[PDB]
Design a protein around this ligand. Structure first.
Ligand SMILES: *[C@@H]1O[C@H](CO)[C@@H](O)[C@H](O)[C@H]1NC(C)=O
Lengths: 49, 22, 48
């Protein structure tokens, strides 16, 4: 019973990761934040100052 | 989970293959 | 024009410095040059 429950839990984790798109929230947020910082730094050249 | 104006992105020391091996 | 060599180029007043290569990307007839997501030129249509 415990082995079956563990296997079902692992499969459910796989299915939830595959279905839910916002699961990787922290990593996606850090990547997007770093990319946005770089993009704003690059766009800062067009500033007239 | 999903050009250069003086910037550069140095590759990580441990590649994804090596991290997966770890 | 020189390709695959780092050369300062001037196409219709672009005055950009870089290396030139044949690009697979397509351009509309009126369009003359392309820009990146960071407002930096990345492709030029040759006027000649
Ligand atoms: C003149 O420029 C045009 C631009 O369309 C080009 O097609 C043509 O080869 C050039 N030279 C001559 C001799 O017409």
């Amino acid at each position: 019973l415990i082995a079956n429950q563990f296997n079902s839990a692992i499969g459910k984790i796989q299915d939830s990761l595959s279905s839910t798109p916002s699961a990787l929230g922290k990593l996606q947020d850090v990547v997007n934040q770093n990319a946005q910082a770089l993009n704003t730094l690059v766009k800062q050249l067009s500033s007239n100052f | 989970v999903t050009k250069f104006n003086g910037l550069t992105v140095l590759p990580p020391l441990l590649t994804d293959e090596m991290i997966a091996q770890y | 024009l020189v390709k695959n060599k780092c050369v300062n180029f001037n196409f219709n007043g672009l005055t950009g410095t870089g290396v030139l290569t044949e690009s697979n990307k397509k351009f509309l007839p009126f369009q003359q040059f392309g820009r990146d997501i960071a407002d930096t030129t990345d492709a030029v249509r040759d006027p000649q």
